[PDB]
Amino acid sequence: ISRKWEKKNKIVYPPQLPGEPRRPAEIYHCRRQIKYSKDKMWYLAKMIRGMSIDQALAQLEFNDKKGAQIIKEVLLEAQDMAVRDHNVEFRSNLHIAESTSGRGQCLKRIRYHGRGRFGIMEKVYCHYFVKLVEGPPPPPEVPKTAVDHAKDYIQQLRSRTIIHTL
Amino acid sequence: ASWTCQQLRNKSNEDLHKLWYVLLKERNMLLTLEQEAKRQRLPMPSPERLEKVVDSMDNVDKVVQEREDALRLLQTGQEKPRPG
Amino acid sequence: AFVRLTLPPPKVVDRWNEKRALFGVYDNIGILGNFEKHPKELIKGPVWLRGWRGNELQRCVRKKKFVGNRMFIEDLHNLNKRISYLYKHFNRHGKYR
Amino acid sequence: GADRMSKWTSKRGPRTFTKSRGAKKTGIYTSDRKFVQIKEMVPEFVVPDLTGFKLKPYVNYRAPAGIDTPLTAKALFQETVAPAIEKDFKEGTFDANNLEKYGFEPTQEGKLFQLYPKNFPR
Amino acid sequence: SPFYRYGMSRPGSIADKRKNPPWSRRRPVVVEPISDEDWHLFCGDMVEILEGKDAGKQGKVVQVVRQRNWVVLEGLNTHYRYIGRTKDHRGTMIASEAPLLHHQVKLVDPVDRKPTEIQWRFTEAGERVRVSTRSGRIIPKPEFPRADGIVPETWTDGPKDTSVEDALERTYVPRLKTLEEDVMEAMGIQETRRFKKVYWY
Amino acid sequence: TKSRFRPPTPEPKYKTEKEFLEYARKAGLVIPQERLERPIHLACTAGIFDPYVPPEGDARMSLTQRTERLRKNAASQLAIRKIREFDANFKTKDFPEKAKDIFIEAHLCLNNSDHDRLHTLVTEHCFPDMVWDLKYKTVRWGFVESLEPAQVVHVRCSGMYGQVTVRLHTRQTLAIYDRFGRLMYGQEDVPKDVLEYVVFERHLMNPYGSWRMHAKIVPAWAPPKQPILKTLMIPGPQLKPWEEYE
RNA sequence: UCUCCAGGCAUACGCGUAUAACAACUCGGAUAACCAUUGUUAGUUAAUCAGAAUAGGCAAUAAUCACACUAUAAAUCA
RNA sequence: AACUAAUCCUAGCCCUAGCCCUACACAAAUAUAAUUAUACUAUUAUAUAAAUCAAAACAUUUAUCCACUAAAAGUAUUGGAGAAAGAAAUUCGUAAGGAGCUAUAGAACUAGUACCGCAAGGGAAAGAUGAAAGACUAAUUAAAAGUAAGAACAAGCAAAGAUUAAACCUUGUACCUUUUGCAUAAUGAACUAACUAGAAAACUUCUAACUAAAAGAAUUACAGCUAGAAACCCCGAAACCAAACGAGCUACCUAAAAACAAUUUUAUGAAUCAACUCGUCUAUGUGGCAAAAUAGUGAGAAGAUUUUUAGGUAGAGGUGAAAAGCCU
Ligand SMILES: [Mg+2]
Ligand SMILES: [Mg+2]
Ligand SMILES: [Mg+2]
Ligand SMILES: [Mg+2]
Ligand SMILES: [Mg+2]
Ligand SMILES: [Mg+2]
Ligand SMILES: [Mg+2]
Ligand SMILES: [Mg+2]
Ligand SMILES: [Mg+2]
Ligand SMILES: [Mg+2]
Ligand SMILES: [Mg+2]
Ligand SMILES: [Mg+2]
Ligand SMILES: [Mg+2]
Ligand SMILES: [Mg+2]
Ligand SMILES: [Mg+2]
Ligand SMILES: [Mg+2]
Ligand SMILES: [Mg+2]
Ligand SMILES: [Mg+2]
Ligand SMILES: [Mg+2]
Ligand SMILES: [Mg+2]
Ligand SMILES: [Mg+2]
Ligand SMILES: [Mg+2]
Ligand SMILES: [Mg+2]
Ligand SMILES: [Mg+2]
């Protein structure tokens, strides 16, 4: 057990100078001991990464997976504790900066078998962490153009040196 | 307050016999009330009363047994009431 | 492996306590005292190994000799088995013959 | 697979197995499987008349309790029998044979309430 | 039980059941054993704080947990906490006293405000009394309300309560007759049958 | 083949009251409240025994109130006498300066968030209000020159607790910041004139008691305070499919 | 309400609260709803159902619808 | 920028020394199917310890197992005179601590409890805030394997020499044990943490004390004698003997009982065929519903029949319509 994602929500930064850029807000929320697999939960967490909170609260609602409702709840708690206790002006000015699922404490039980034999069953739990950062979703990755691809090849050749000699 | 052992000694056997039944009816009522509290899942009013009554009844038992025990020693001298 | 995350408490030894200060006194009681008492007589320990040393098999047999008749049944049984194990080891095993 | 740790009671076992829960017997089983209750074996509660009783379950706090002195055989003897013997000794009308005059009981046999062995319950 | 820690809450309260569950195995507290005669601190005695946050401030003992060698003084060594906290409301901030060990406080001379050490000694009547080591003087036991909270003098007789005079009344007559034999004579029961011989063994 | 197994131990993990509270609500329990063996200690009482209704036009008086206080002193004369009996040093004329010291000193602690200093300066009733809403928040506060001298408005003693009300019109500068240092409320540095009534009370019975800041009376004619910088949405009713808006 | 399946109610031996309602939603049911799970409170009422005095004397003749009918393996306290 | 986790100190324990004991627990109940208030039928240890093991087998035999220290002395004696065993006479003596353990350690122990076996019996695991919780239970840590943060990009025991460059280019037949001193063999290892195997002083060497003498009584000596230091592991059978515990499974028997419709023969270890008993064949299953079942198909079904309840026979034995079959 180690609950550090809970403490990070309490960090206090020093006041800014009159012309410093306005620091974007960060929120740290999670839920523990969820009756779900961490491997199954990752697909839901991976999906929402890099999206807004009104664009991640829509994709989740129409997913059949059980975890979709669980994540949606902690994406609404995060969306409320940001506006009330972290000074976020607009509900629609957030985006999921990070989101991942972690292993929890499990329980060991006996799964019976057919010849007086058995195997060890584990009832699986997990945790799920999310960070929300105030600001529109960073623009997506732009694929390298053909010109950019060609430039790297030339740059690679330009770096060539005469090896193993003065 | 509950009856102390010394005070009961001053009373005669007649009062001890009468007092026991007075306490007995009190104990039944508190046992009746305490049990009813469990059914209603509500705290019993003044739960301390039962302890006082029970302690009083024990004191009456102590006094009567002591009086009888002394008489046996004088007449017979046997330490215990039952053969063994 | 894992190691302590904090320093253990400091251990302080008083080297001038009565037991340490007077340690060794009367070790020459015999030669300086007209040999009235042998220094071995000053040892505090089990009755069967005051002023005596031997290997475990000898130690086992010596414990039996002094207090064999005052020992508990289970302790005596274990001692007897301990002797028989040592006997077969020291008298029938080992690299050298 | 039998539970060894639970108490052996009459609810368990076959129909034939039976035992009491501690209730005192009050009758006799005669021949032909007929029960015959005995009135004397049935306890009778001697209940006093509580009219005019000045004692209640609880006592006033103001009333001060006294020093506890467990009654002893010597103390009872001094209170009851010693004064009679002391006065009789001065008068000279005392003899070893007539200790019963002061209340001595040579044997408990013949007493309704035998001191030892006790033949009466609480 | 070997693993039972005495705290500040009175034993058997909801707090003490919560703190000490049956499976608790907390590290034992080591307490300098103090003889019943040795102990000289009693509820209501004014004492002075030798060291701590409020060192040098005199207070009144209001609780003594002898199992922990603790003495609690009113309004001193006091930290802050919230009482009556609810989901709707924060609660009321109050200042809560903390326990002090005996060696951190001293008793006070009755006449003069000073931390005078005392010794136990008998009197002419024989009653044990505390006497100051210096400026030998009798410090009386401080009268304090009882824990149950019942006040004797103001207590008013009510139904189910015997009068003081009635309790004091004595009617026991020393006689060599059992209760089983006095009741029958008083109640007029007559029985002429006698139990048959019984073979005890 | 062989066979051996282990038990699923019940493992109750509730070692704390927060864990126990969940346990007793799920498990169910009769938790009878108890009469505290030792009564709790109160160094202050929430509220004012007699609140002095502020007089309309008190700002227009730009002596003056002090004369009015003299007429109102007769109402508070009984309270003043009680202070003399237990203190004998309290002075109505000199209290403003002392009270002024407490007010300025207390608000300064906020700058450094010195909880220990505040507890001495303010009462147990005052402390939770000032500090509770300023957790994880930096507050910059200074004292600009006072516009007018302070006077003692009213004093009341009930029990035994004595409460003193002081009129304070002083210019101040306050700027609150978020955790991230962004600015909410107030202004970086601009003098603002503030008129308020502050209640100072002391425990007459306790030997170690002292005058502290308990509460501030707010008048109805007070002008609205500075509005917060950020815009806020007052949400609308949340309606189930059954319900309909009106 | 509809569709379809076809060992069911008691007794004994056994088991020992798994019974019933309420409340919870950690654990158990191999998933859910719901509880068989957790906690609290209750429960199964009998003269008929069921279970738990002495000393002598003396018995040739089955059962099977017991009549017919035969047989052989020769067959229940009063 | 963290999940899983890790850190921790006292609970008790170990070996000695001293010391015989006089801790035999209200009231009630228990030898009846223990813990059921009263009569029935009454109540009582054991003939010599064996074997393993050693004698490189085994058959006589085999220290301890099975009467004060040191010396005489490993001497006299005994012994398939082998392994081995081993005296006495006679001398001598007044006798509370820890270079121990600290939660996989120390006792099995938080407990002879849970759990397992019909029974005898076998037998665990774990805990961790602070002065105060009548201060919203602390802390502390890039720290194990495992994951996440952050899937991958021709080519190869995964590396090394390198290089401007992570990969391309060059060089290179996993480890241990084991076989011959060879493996592309053959054994053993998914990984992490903790635990887990060389021990004795006759002879020798080295170092000192005194020295025809050495040794704090008995010993050795034609330079010796005394003291010191210096040495020889771990895990694993099939078995053998003693004494308890088992016939609620199963073989057999005693006693008290129960079930058998319809049809045809007749008057029955006869016939057709259910209930019921059994288990010829095929198929599926194969960690299975099942540590022997399921679906079909088959055999008997008034008898040497099946079933129920209680009791008896116990391992050098019991039982056996003999399969060396059964006896949880
Ligand atoms: Mg099975
Ligand atoms: Mg697995
Ligand atoms: Mg139910
Ligand atoms: Mg329900
Ligand atoms: Mg299943
Ligand atoms: Mg239930
Ligand atoms: Mg009947
Ligand atoms: Mg051999
Ligand atoms: Mg052989
Ligand atoms: Mg252990
Ligand atoms: Mg263990
Ligand atoms: Mg790691
Ligand atoms: Mg390569
Ligand atoms: Mg392998
Ligand atoms: Mg071996
Ligand atoms: Mg049988
Ligand atoms: Mg057979
Ligand atoms: Mg038929
Ligand atoms: Mg068969
Ligand atoms: Mg056929
Ligand atoms: Mg046929
Ligand atoms: Mg037939
Ligand atoms: Mg054959
Ligand atoms: Mg078997």
From Swiss-Prot, chain A:
Record localization: Mitochondrion
Predominant subcellular localization, coarse grouping: mitochondrion
GO MF term list: structural constituent of ribosome
GO cellular component, one term: mitochondrial inner membrane
Keyword vocabulary terms for this entry: Mitochondrion, Ribonucleoprotein, Ribosomal protein, Transit peptide
This protein's record includes keyword Ribosomal protein: yes
GO term, biological process aspect, one: mitochondrial translation
Subunit and partners: Component of the mitochondrial ribosome large subunit (39S) which comprises a 16S rRNA and about 50 distinct proteins.
Similarity comment: family membership: Belongs to the universal ribosomal protein uL22 family.
Protein name, UniProt field: Large ribosomal subunit protein uL22m
Higher taxonomy: Eukaryota, Metazoa, Chordata, Craniata, Vertebrata
Swiss-Prot record, chain B:
Gene Ontology BP, a term: mitochondrial translation
Assembly and interaction partners: Component of the mitochondrial ribosome large subunit (39S) which comprises a 16S rRNA and about 50 distinct proteins.
Keyword terms of this UniProt record: Acetylation, Mitochondrion, Ribonucleoprotein, Ribosomal protein, Transit peptide
Protein name per the record: Large ribosomal subunit protein uL29m
Organism of origin: Mus musculus
Top-level taxon in the UniProt lineage: Eukaryota
GO cellular component term of the entry, any: mitochondrial large ribosomal subunit
GO molecular function: structural constituent of ribosome
Residue numbers carrying N6-acetyllysine: K62
Family per record: Belongs to the universal ribosomal protein uL29 family.
Compartment(s) of residence: Mitochondrion
Residue ranges of the TM segments: none
Major place of residence: mitochondrion
UniProtKB/Swiss-Prot annotation, chain D:
Location within or outside the cell: Mitochondrion
Keyword Nucleus on entry: no
Lineage top rank: taxon: Eukaryota
GO cellular component: mitochondrial inner membrane; mitochondrial large ribosomal subunit; mitochondrion; ribonucleoprotein complex
Signal peptide residues on this chain, from the entry's feature table: none
Keywords, in A-Z order: Apoptosis, Cell cycle, Mitochondrion, Ribonucleoprotein, Ribosomal protein, Transit peptide
Single GO biological process annotation from the record: translation
Entries under Pfam families matching the protein: MRP-L27
A molecular function (GO) term: structural constituent of ribosome
InterPro entries the UniProt entry points to: Ribosomal_mL41
Function, in words: Component of the mitochondrial ribosome large subunit. Also involved in apoptosis and cell cycle. Enhances p53/TP53 stability, thereby contributing to p53/TP53-induced apoptosis in response to growth-inhibitory condition. Enhances p53/TP53 translocation to the mitochondria. Has the ability to arrest the cell cycle at the G1 phase, possibly by stabilizing the CDKN1A and CDKN1B (p27Kip1) proteins.
Subunit structure comment from the entry: Component of the mitochondrial ribosome large subunit (39S) which comprises a 16S rRNA and about 50 distinct proteins. Interacts with BCL2.
Protein family according to the UniProt entry: Belongs to the mitochondrion-specific ribosomal protein mL41 family.
Protein's name in the database: Large ribosomal subunit protein mL41
UniProtKB/Swiss-Prot annotation, chain E:
Main location: mitochondrion
Gene name of the encoded protein: Mrpl24
Record's subunit section: Component of the mitochondrial ribosome large subunit (39S) which comprises a 16S rRNA and about 50 distinct proteins.
Every KOW domain range: 41-74
Compartments where found: Mitochondrion
Keywords: Mitochondrion, Phosphoprotein, Ribonucleoprotein, Ribosomal protein, Transit peptide
Phosphoserine: residues bearing it: S9
Listed GO MF terms: RNA binding; structural constituent of ribosome
Family recorded in the similarity comment: Belongs to the universal ribosomal protein uL24 family.
Species of provenance: Mus musculus (Mouse)
One of the GO biological process terms: mitochondrial translation
Organism taxonomic ancestry: Eukaryota, Metazoa, Chordata, Craniata, Vertebrata
The protein's name: Large ribosomal subunit protein uL24m
